[model samples]
Target: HMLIYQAIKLIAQAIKVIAEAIKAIAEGDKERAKEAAEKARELYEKALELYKEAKKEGDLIAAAIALIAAAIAVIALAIAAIAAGDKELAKEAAELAKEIYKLAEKLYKEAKKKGDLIAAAIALIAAAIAVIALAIAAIAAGDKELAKEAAKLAKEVYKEAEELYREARKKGDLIAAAIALIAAAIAVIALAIAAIAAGDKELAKKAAELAEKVYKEALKVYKEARKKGDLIAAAIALIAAAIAVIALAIAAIAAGDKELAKKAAELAKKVLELAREIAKEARKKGDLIAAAIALIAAAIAVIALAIAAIAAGDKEEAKEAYELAKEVYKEALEIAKEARKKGDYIAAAIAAIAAAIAVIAAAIAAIAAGKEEAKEAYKLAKEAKEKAKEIAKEAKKAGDKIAAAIAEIAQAIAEIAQAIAEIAL
Candidate 1:
């Protein structure tokens, strides 16, 4: 299930890349389309490997969904590359999609041998992938009639997949149900990206709606799973929902829908808060790693929300988020310091990096307000950054690459602190 979530994440990233490619094409920038296509292709390949790994681990249902997602990614990239007149890339992507489809079909058969519900769910998703492939091929051949027909079939298949998910839920397989919903959300986002690339606002809007619907359902299942003591499932769901919401926010921003973007950002913040709550609970049960990672995720989410607030021109909200993030960062820093005292230098370094980011966030909010506050904030941030750097140095001396990266981030934050001081001047 973790593997499935990882594949979904990679697919989401590929969708974002495809969206960028679409935007570039709309702006008549073939160069950007080519670059985005290559990036999307790489993500698809990575997702494919993960899917294969899951299959090897005896999770045929998840493997099937992952394959469909990878295939959609390849098809999306192929469409974008073709639009950019990159026939070589398009050809390569098409071949990859074909291979992914074959693998998906095989996985579907394998899943069928496991159970009726799993088989039905896998079949619906696989059917959708097949139709999507047909739609792509039709468009390539300049046959709008065939393309439209294939799209209709794909939508029907998606609806059937949802029904299958409902059936699975009734059978007490919430994990499978939730995973299916997450996969459905991913596929819808992929469709939305392709629609945006083709300048189809109506189609894109519809796809976004479906994606949100699936994510909402997925969140419900995840909460239920958590209530049943499935913390790992809960964690995966939180991460998946957070990423999906952020993707929606990005899509909204790209479409110049500030209100929608703000809503999505708020949703992401809420989901991340839930994740932090789970982590806090885990810490009480003595799961230090989970607790630490949860704090890190919370800090990142706070920073992301702050950025979104700034984008929406809500300085007060940004300041609030930054302040909240600062607190979380401090909490994480304390945790890391404890670990360091226990000789876990790498964890300490990571926590120090989190602290640096927190201070920088504070500096950003202060700088946005004006020179006087910026000066004080810059000085405070610089001090914190230096401390974080020392922590990183300690970890580096222990030969930890993670600590080295943390030091790099601390150094960057220090430079930003200096720039803030200059801004005040």
Candidate 2:
């Protein structure tokens, strides 16, 4: 129900956004549309920030909202990358990358959850796009076809995108979540360097630094979040290992196989030890991440408080200052979201490449499978040939039917070739 409700809400939000965008576009109000886009973009930006805060604050709802925000932000960045130009598009791609990196890191921290792993895996596809786009951009103009391919890949990756949110909600692993996002961001940056490598060194520098900042912050949070769930995952691993060991013992006794028993015992012990180490390290990382989150927040709070104090000298001035601070914070968040989304767009591009590769891979697999079918068909053909040779097989009940079947296979193969040609387009 939670998944359904969230999905519905996401759809509703998308509809609302699309409606507004269309209205603005219809009114010949590019400015309005752009503003709306910016607003939508900023809202998600703020949402990501809040989500990170929620993780630190240990609030599940906040974390969920963050995930939603991050998802939208990543998608929007992709749109921007397409509609906008090089500089801005690259910026957007950068954002998407950041979020993906964070998510990857977060998932790695909690490698036990298949759900989280699935999300992380999908996010990797997004990261891959960004990387591939960078490579493609280096040699070409990253024309419309490339852009379309990128978008298509992103759509596919994001198709299973909702699963991450589901998994994140199931277990509020803040450290894992933040790390996944940070890693994604890093990947985006690496990719941006590829596609957005204009002669502007300063812009590239700033982008790199910005990504680093987000990663550092998220890493700290991830370590802290690790404290909460590390033990549980370790325990699960250990219990499974113990069960394996027990089963091995019983099998060994039943079969009277000492060597098998020894191997099983060693493997189970090794697994248990590894699980214990994971728990211990998780706690360590969690503490570090937690402390980092605190220190950063404290620094920001102090700065904010000082600014507030300075403004206190004049009520009107202080009010203005407060609003300005809020706006600045909001902008900062927007920047982060934009960076994260751009990364995703870049990642999407990589996925399209993967999709193309997968299509080829599937073709190869099909070919392998088809060989057997071909052999069967060949055997039938040979038998038919021999029959035709040995008028001995009688007149052969229906020569036309066999001929028709062979013709059908040939025609089907031709049709497949035609379809493949269309795909080449």
Candidate 3:
């Protein structure tokens, strides 16, 4: 019922945004006609995708939404990298990002109440990641109103992630633990983004310092995942490490410190090695059992390296990792196809998502590292934020609108599930 209500409301809000577009076209006060038309075209394409995903069989509703939550949330922060030349787009992108964050957060809560672990795990993790994007986008947008909202929303996300992590600790749920640290790192990034936006150098300086602590914490916990032998938890830890690198790298670059950024690039190199090691370990010891987990871990490891390399200028290193990721993922996929069971369906789901996201990540890595635009983006980000205070003031407001505007790139958890489900079966 809550899902239905929110779904209906999203439709209405979307319609209202378009309703104003063409009407303004008719008026010819027509201040941004070209941008308006481009925006309208995307809105239509997104509408089609949203329409297609409307069937709510709901068993995997939690799953689809969780995947989509990652989609929408990651999209918002992407603006920081690519950025919008149009501040209006900056404002629009942030608004949409915030809206989807709301949907993902609520859907997670809704799923938790219904006792769904898969969706529940993704919810806090995605929101933790999403909220940072929200605040960062707000910072890019430089909209004071959005900043105020971003602060509260970010704080709430941090608290929720904390609460979730505590519970997982009590239950000794390693998957949740790994996932929780990923969220915890991301949530702290949000706070750091807020601190920078507010010009609190003390807090901003302290923020990445805090993220590094999680980096240490995650490294230790991920070490424990080895003895625990939960491959799905292994995937969780890999992404946790990815975000830790991401948080540290972004703060380093945004704060314009090349050394810290170098550290992030170093971290990228480490995760790359870690993924390769995991695949080898899983292959030798639990090849038949954990092949799919290897695939998931291997794929996302590249995703992390790609972003980390770009953020820190380790393009050649990512290339080295990228080729192997492709090789490892394909090899593991073959093993994954060998045995099929719902017991590893969670691994399937995660693998399917890694397949999708890492594809995007690889392309960007290849594209950014392959070309020089990644350099521009990094320089641009550094340019955008020379100081924590300037980050707030000098925002070119790069609101590139990653996939959030797509509304739900994975709009079909049932779909990709069915896709991976096909392989799993």
Candidate 2 residue 63 Cα shift, in angstroms, is: 3.1
- RMSD per model, one decimal: 9.0, 26.6, 12.8
Best by lDDT: 1
| Candidate 2 error regions (>4 Å) | 1-15, 18-29, 57-65, 80-90, 111-425
Q: Which model, 1 or 2, shows the larger lDDT? A: 1
Residues 1-425, candidate 3: write the lDDT tens digits: 33433333243333333323323333433444344435433543453344235325563343334334333423322342223334565565565556556666776687667755455656665565556655655665666566556656766766666566666656677777677677677776776676656655555555568567666766666677777776556656776776766667656645656677667667766765676677667756644435445455555556555655665676676576456545554554444333223233323333433344444344445543563433332332222122212211221232312212121221221122222212211
- Over the full model, what C-alpha lDDT does candidate 1 score relative to the true structure? 0.60
lDDT of 1 by residue, 1-425 (tens): 56655654454455456445545554667887777777777777787787778778887656665666676577667667656876566556646655665566556545645665654455446545545554454444444554455445545545655765687788887656755564465455445444534445565566657657765875887688788987655655554465456446434643556676587668757866786797678667755555655565565456446545654667677667656756766677776777667666655655565566556556555644446656666676667667666766776677665555545555554554444444444
Candidate 2, 229: how far from true, in Å?
A: 31
Give candidate 1's TM-score: 0.54
- Models 1 onward score TM values of 0.54, 0.27, 0.60
Better of 2 and 3 by TM-score: 3
How high a TM-score does candidate 3 get? Answer: 0.60
Q: Give the alpha carbon lDDT tens digit for every residue of 249-278 in model 2.
A: 333333344553444434433433343344
Clashes of each: 0, 54, 5
What C-alpha lDDT do the candidate models reach, one value each? 0.60, 0.35, 0.51
Better of 1 and 3 by TM-score: 3
